[PDB]
Design a protein around this ligand. Structure first.
Ligand SMILES: [Cl-]
Ligand SMILES: [Cl-]
Ligand SMILES: [Xe]
Ligand SMILES: [Xe]
Ligand SMILES: [Xe]
Ligand SMILES: [Xe]
Length: 162
């Protein structure tokens, strides 16, 4: 198991533009295209992201390409954020993957506001972190996924993805 596999299970793969859980235009492996309600905006952003006139559709490879850039950006995001990096460097490989997940999902900013879980995580207080993390909009809105992620952060193992 690894971040790419982990994320490919949580996010799925769609070759045509779609709306996500919040109702926003997405494509491929969870690549958010735009929070705007215009399908045309989405397609424009899409064509820009891709480099051709896709007409709202991409190949498996182009999606994979986006996913890679996205996983990268996410990690970089982490490393460039003052509240995040120390937490993350403190963590083992598994649990880092859990951090990347959340970030891929909710941006750096939002994860950066889990102040309290951040400290518990840093002190390696796994169970308390886990309870804290669950008290969130994230968890109530996407409970099955949040639990996989929380279990991974709480255990340091891939059992929830098995
Ligand atoms: Cl892009
Ligand atoms: Cl769910
Ligand atoms: Xe983190
Ligand atoms: Xe995490
Ligand atoms: Xe977190
Ligand atoms: Xe956790």
């Amino acid at each position: 198991m690894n971040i790419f596999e982990m994320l490919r299970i949580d996010e799925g793969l769609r070759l045509k533009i779609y709306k996500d859980t919040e109702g926003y235009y997405t494509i491929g492996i969870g690549h958010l295209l735009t929070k705007s309600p215009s399908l045309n905006a989405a397609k424009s952003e899409l064509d820009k992201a891709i480099g051709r006139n896709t007409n709202g559709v991409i190949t498996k490879d182009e999606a994979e390409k986006l996913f890679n850039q996205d996983v990268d950006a996410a990690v970089r995001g982490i490393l460039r954020n003052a509240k995040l990096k120390p937490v993350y460097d403190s963590l083992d490989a598994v649990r880092r993957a859990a951090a990347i997940n959340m970030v891929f999902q909710m941006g750096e900013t939002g994860v950066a506001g889990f102040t309290n879980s951040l400290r518990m995580l840093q002190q390696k207080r796994w169970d308390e972190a886990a309870v804290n993390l669950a008290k969130s909009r994230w968890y109530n809105q996407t409970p099955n996924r949040a639990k996989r992620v929380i279990t991974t952060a709480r255990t340091g193992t891939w059992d929830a993805y098995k």
